[PDB]
Structure 1
């Protein structure tokens, strides 16, 4: 793990589209590092024209930071490539996002795999906080699976690399972020909060049915995501505290890490469930 590697528009190969989003489309590809006769499997994301347009020197900077994230639970930017469009290169993640994944195994996932992912995700965010970096878009759909036992937060820096100039994940945003577009490690803890809920409810859509536009209000009124079925009061409670109105009263990642680590140490005492290696995303990468 080192700094940012700049590629030439002929050092990688787009093999096949895996799926386009709103920030751009992604392909399965190979990396032919000029020099060595080695070819490593990556993932190429070709962003779309940005409204604001940050010159090739600034874009180039944010990319370094994204390239400097060194932690087992936070995808790092391997290589960038500027041409008439920008393309980001990163190590490909076999199983896809942790969201589709938990939905696709709602009866195969045990108390231990959840608690663990919780701890790992905390771990990662705690790192991003140590480096005075705010994610702004944590969410189960942004946690990729390397293996059912190792997950990592992704997309760090991609959002802000285009939409911090003046859509929005309202249901993952903390009150302040919604009302004033305020983002901090404490606002992330809010999101962490939802992310844990998505997991505990095997991929249920949060505030499902309620329009986004209505969220700020119900939120101010004292409304929160419900206690998931499999959650004892102990677990839910922590999910709730990440949704306090006063950011400063929300648990700190280092605290979270410690909590879930403890529970992970007696899973069946905090999560009650009745009682994998696959995902249709994996079927597309084979």
Structure 2
């Protein structure tokens, strides 16, 4: 079965990872052999959920997290493979001094590949952000949490600072609005985890965007890279780069990293063991 319906006794929530926007995520073990997993519990009609869930379990790309199972008790619990290194936002914030140009550019490539794959599956993420990119290994990141937004009425009567103008104003979500969010995610990485429009009230975001104001150029960014970001935030959705084009361009830059990102001491660059702690779901 592509989407395994797990019994409430097959898995167990041990520790709390964090409070998401759609529910609380726990760290746990899935005993079909104990498989380390992340379990998200959301805040019958479960057929729509099971249908939307199926899509989440049928994705097969190395840069996209896949849902492994679901438990429909009093609440809905989503089970997926645990990514021991946590989310990319916290990762860059914590290694702000040992992250080189090579790693940053490759993460941009990987995220673009994962998004292009979702685009091929006609799946709009609706909530791409560095917090929703997980680290399998420092050299391997993956996108997660796609689809949840829609499953909970995102485009029905909110991460405003990551949303495309048209999404804010008209609840219009497309692969091109995801490109906008990709632009912001890239900005979060290049600034080592800064908060976008920090201080600025969410209620005023649409206003400044219409005025042509945009997030500032990250210090390590050459104008070559910043331009890509700005293009992702053009009002005309169809004018924004396509994920296919972003893969090609960041891949180009990944071949000569120090030419596009200026990081002092680049050439020379807690630990999730005692943090997270059995066969890896990947091996299983």
Normalised by the length of structure 2, the TM-score is 0.92
Distance 1:244 1:215, change over 3 A: same
User: What is the alpha-carbon distance in structure 1 between the residues aligned to residue 245 and residue 28 of structure 2?
Assistant: 39
Moved more, 275-284 or 131-140: 275-284
CA shift at 1:166, angstroms? 3.5
Distance 1:87 1:29, change over 3 A: same
**Pairwise CA RMSD of aligned residues?**
2.5
CA deviations 1:43-71 (Å, max 9, x no partner) are 111111xxxxx702111100100001111
The one of 206, 216, 219 equivalent to 1:216 is 206
Specify the SS of the correspondent of 2:255.
coil
User: What is the alpha-carbon distance in structure 2 between the residues aligned to residue 243 and residue 261 of structure 1?
Assistant: 20
User: What is the alpha-carbon distance in structure 1 between the residues aligned to residue 98 and residue 171 of structure 2?
Assistant: 38
User: What is the alpha-carbon distance in structure 2 between the residues aligned to residue 166 and residue 239 of structure 1?
Assistant: 29
Specify the SS of the correspondent of 2:51.
helix
| 8 Å CA contact 1:115, 1:267 repeated in 2 | yes
Distance 1:135 1:55, change over 3 A: same
CA shift at 1:283, angstroms? 5.9
Distance 1:278 1:260, change over 3 A: closer
Runs of at least 5 residues in structure 2 that lack an aligned partner in the other structure: 277-284
CA shift at 1:135, angstroms? 0.3
CA deviations 1:224-249 (Å, max 9, x no partner) are 11111000010001111001110000
User: What is the alpha-carbon distance in structure 2 between the residues aligned to residue 276 and residue 10 of structure 1?
Assistant: 49
CA shift at 1:261, angstroms? 0.3
User: What is the alpha-carbon distance in structure 1 between the residues aligned to residue 269 and residue 64 of structure 2?
Assistant: 21
CA shift at 1:124, angstroms? 0.2
Distance 1:128 1:259, change over 3 A: same
- The equivalent of 2:182 in structure 1 is 192
CA shift at 1:167, angstroms? 13
CA shift at 1:163, angstroms? 3.1
| 8 Å CA contact 1:20, 1:26 repeated in 2 | yes
| 8 Å CA contact 1:96, 1:281 repeated in 2 | no
CA shift at 1:285, angstroms? 3.5
Specify the SS of the correspondent of 2:162.
coil
CA shift at 1:19, angstroms? 1.9
CA shift at 1:278, angstroms? 18
- The equivalent of 2:281 in structure 1 is none
- The equivalent of 1:246 in structure 2 is 236
More helix by share: 2
- The equivalent of 1:42 in structure 2 is 37
| 8 Å CA contact 2:100, 2:269 repeated in 1 | no
CA deviations 1:69-91 (Å, max 9, x no partner) are 11111111000010111101000
Aligned length: 276
User: What is the alpha-carbon distance in structure 1 between the residues aligned to residue 76 and residue 155 of structure 2?
Assistant: 18
CA deviations 1:175-215 (Å, max 9, x no partner) are 10011110000000000000000001111111111111111
